[PDB]
Design a protein around this ligand. Structure first.
Ligand SMILES: [Mg+2]
Ligand SMILES: [Mg+2]
Ligand SMILES: [Mg+2]
Ligand SMILES: [Mg+2]
Ligand SMILES: [Mg+2]
Ligand SMILES: [Mg+2]
Ligand SMILES: [Mg+2]
Ligand SMILES: [Mg+2]
Ligand SMILES: [Mg+2]
Ligand SMILES: [Mg+2]
Ligand SMILES: [Mg+2]
Ligand SMILES: [Mg+2]
Ligand SMILES: [Mg+2]
Ligand SMILES: [Mg+2]
Ligand SMILES: [Mg+2]
Ligand SMILES: [Mg+2]
Ligand SMILES: [Mg+2]
Ligand SMILES: [Mg+2]
Ligand SMILES: [Mg+2]
Ligand SMILES: [Mg+2]
Ligand SMILES: [Mg+2]
Ligand SMILES: [Mg+2]
Ligand SMILES: [Mg+2]
Ligand SMILES: [Mg+2]
Ligand SMILES: [Mg+2]
Ligand SMILES: [Mg+2]
Ligand SMILES: [Mg+2]
Ligand SMILES: [Mg+2]
Ligand SMILES: [Mg+2]
Ligand SMILES: [Mg+2]
Ligand SMILES: [Mg+2]
Ligand SMILES: [Mg+2]
Ligand SMILES: [Mg+2]
Ligand SMILES: [Mg+2]
Ligand SMILES: [Mg+2]
Ligand SMILES: [Mg+2]
Ligand SMILES: [Mg+2]
Ligand SMILES: [Mg+2]
Ligand SMILES: [Mg+2]
Ligand SMILES: [Mg+2]
Ligand SMILES: [Mg+2]
Ligand SMILES: [Mg+2]
Ligand SMILES: [Mg+2]
Ligand SMILES: [Mg+2]
Ligand SMILES: [Mg+2]
Ligand SMILES: [Mg+2]
Ligand SMILES: [Mg+2]
Ligand SMILES: [Mg+2]
Ligand SMILES: [Mg+2]
Ligand SMILES: [Mg+2]
Ligand SMILES: [Mg+2]
Ligand SMILES: [Mg+2]
Ligand SMILES: [Mg+2]
Ligand SMILES: [Mg+2]
Lengths: 48, 142, 117
RNA sequence: AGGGGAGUGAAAUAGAACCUGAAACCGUAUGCGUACAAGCAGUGGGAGCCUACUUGUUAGGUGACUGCGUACCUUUUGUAUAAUGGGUCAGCGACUUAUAUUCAGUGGCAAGCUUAACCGUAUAGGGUAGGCGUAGCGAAAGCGAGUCUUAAUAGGGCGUU
RNA sequence: GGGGCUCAAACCACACACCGAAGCUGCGGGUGUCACGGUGACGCGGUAGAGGAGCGUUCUGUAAGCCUGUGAAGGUG
């Protein structure tokens, strides 16, 4: 039981996915927003 | 165990003499181009010239069928506007008999540096004699 | 924690410029042009592993034709005769005998001929 | 001006525009190729020449000749497109943070769970005011494993093991 | 498409042979899902997009450790 030997259970923590980092990540370029439109821009939210 | 390839410094070339004395122009020209390229030898490779030398003696006695003696035309452009010129088979035989066979064979060869090298091994004459007795060409029946 | 990109960016550009060695002009010395040249070179190499197998069968078949017609047979009639009797020898091995071992090629052509094909 | 020596220094290619000294860009030297040859410049095959040593089923450099082969990004029904963007290199440059929430994964307690401000021997311990759950139906009064509608313990809506 | 093609290298019938794809088979590898206890089976083109698994950079703990002038980081083969 040492500080460089303890971790969490599998599935307890994830990484978060970062859009816009290359092709191989699956979220590059548009970042998951599709193409042009309102819900593709900064602040592009539809009111509830 | 790689595939054999011919080497240009160690290729064996022969000399042949072909008489055009009543042969159809295009069926004689296809046999000539086949041997200029070396397609009749197992050593043939696509990128080296493995062919033979062909001498053609009676170049003015080649013939064409149908109505092609007067209806077959040869065109060329001089590079000047309106500079398109033509001559038919009958008149070209009278003026430059050898140009008829060379034009047919040249169009059946590849159009690249290697194709122009195979063409240099074709000697066309309009007599019954050639100036290449020292090379001792062997007879080729069509 | 501010991260500087200098060392990693330089290491990545040098890997591409090393694969572009021997290319002409800017294709071997500027990254933007050398990156496209390396990609297209790898596109060609993938396609030409398929074409290498096509270009070599065509060469064997042309040489077998030249050797068979020296024994009085065409390529298409020799292949039918070989299949009729027994022989499973490759076009690759056959083209080697046609050039190097001419007495063995004659025996095979004569046996294929004797199968009436 | 600038240099070649000599000296100092562990080290002057640490010499004052002075640590390290990358790339674009510009040169000198050597090896091979290139003056009859047509196009995204590469790749499949491939002779010859030069170098090194294991003297050729080897390693390195060039690549005569030949088969295939119209850049990348964006935007589009569709681009080699004569549609947009970029002269090149180096450095920088675009999904974050706070507070309220819902779902999933993984843990602590469990008919209970959890504290907020704040005290504090200060990441402990205290503080259970509050929040959510253990019961629903009705617009409500209210009644409750039922309740609402209705003249109706009939029917029906929602809820209950 | 060009050369060239006339008892065709055109057209109409019939016949046999061959060539010809990254299709199928052979040989050698890698992976996804399912079943059984490593084997079997069929899968493995891909934009928008959804899901899974990783590499590398800087800083903090492990670290009053370990490496390092008998040569660190960086640069260049
Ligand atoms: Mg995608
Ligand atoms: Mg999305
Ligand atoms: Mg856009
Ligand atoms: Mg649209
Ligand atoms: Mg949209
Ligand atoms: Mg804005
Ligand atoms: Mg930075
Ligand atoms: Mg080169
Ligand atoms: Mg082929
Ligand atoms: Mg093939
Ligand atoms: Mg000194
Ligand atoms: Mg130095
Ligand atoms: Mg120094
Ligand atoms: Mg210092
Ligand atoms: Mg300096
Ligand atoms: Mg430099
Ligand atoms: Mg120069
Ligand atoms: Mg030259
Ligand atoms: Mg010329
Ligand atoms: Mg040019
Ligand atoms: Mg041309
Ligand atoms: Mg090669
Ligand atoms: Mg070599
Ligand atoms: Mg080449
Ligand atoms: Mg080439
Ligand atoms: Mg092309
Ligand atoms: Mg081409
Ligand atoms: Mg653009
Ligand atoms: Mg448009
Ligand atoms: Mg349009
Ligand atoms: Mg339209
Ligand atoms: Mg196109
Ligand atoms: Mg363009
Ligand atoms: Mg243009
Ligand atoms: Mg415009
Ligand atoms: Mg353009
Ligand atoms: Mg526009
Ligand atoms: Mg511009
Ligand atoms: Mg900045
Ligand atoms: Mg959950
Ligand atoms: Mg729980
Ligand atoms: Mg009821
Ligand atoms: Mg019910
Ligand atoms: Mg063609
Ligand atoms: Mg017939
Ligand atoms: Mg078939
Ligand atoms: Mg194949
Ligand atoms: Mg397949
Ligand atoms: Mg297999
Ligand atoms: Mg498939
Ligand atoms: Mg796929
Ligand atoms: Mg640390
Ligand atoms: Mg050292
Ligand atoms: Mg550091």
């Amino acid at each position: 039981m040492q500080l460089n030997d303890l971790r969490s259970a599998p599935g307890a923590r994830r990484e978060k996915h970062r859009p816009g980092r290359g092709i191989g990540s699956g979220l590059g370029k548009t970042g998951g927003r599709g193409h042009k439109g309102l819900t593709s821009r900064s602040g592009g939210k539809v009111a509830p | 165990m790689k595939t054999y390839t011919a080497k240009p410094e160690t290729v064996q070339r022969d000399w042949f003499v072909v008489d055009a004395a009543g042969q159809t122009l295009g069926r004689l020209a296809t046999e000539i181009a086949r041997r200029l390229r070396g397609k009749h030898k197992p050593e043939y490779t696509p990128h080296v010239d493995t062919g033979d030398y062909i001498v053609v003696i009676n170049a003015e006695q080649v013939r064409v069928t149908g109505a092609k003696t007067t209806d077959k035309m040869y065109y060329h452009h001089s590079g000047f506007p309106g500079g398109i010129k033509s001559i038919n088979f009958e008149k070209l035989i009278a003026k430059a008999p050898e140009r008829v066979i060379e034009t047919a064979v040249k169009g059946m060869l590849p159009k690249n540096p290697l194709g122009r090298d195979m063409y240099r091994k074709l000697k066309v004459y309009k007599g019954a004699s050639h100036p290449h007795t020292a090379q001792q060409p062997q007879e080729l029946k069509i | 924690a501010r991260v500087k990109r200098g060392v990693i960016a330089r290491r990545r550009h040098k890997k591409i410029l090393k694969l572009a060695k021997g290319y002409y002009g800017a294709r071997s010395r500027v990254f933007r042009v050398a990156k496209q040249a390396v990609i297209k070179a790898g596109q060609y190499a993938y396609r030409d592993r398929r074409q290498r197998k096509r270009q070599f069968r065509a060469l064997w078949i042309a040489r077998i034709n030249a050797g068979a017609r020296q024994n009085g047979l065409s390529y298409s009639r020799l292949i039918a005769g070989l299949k009729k009797a027994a022989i499973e020898i490759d076009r690759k091995v056959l083209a080697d005998l046609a050039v190097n071992e001419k007495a063995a090629f004659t025996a095979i052509v004569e046996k294929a001929k004797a199968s009436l094909a």
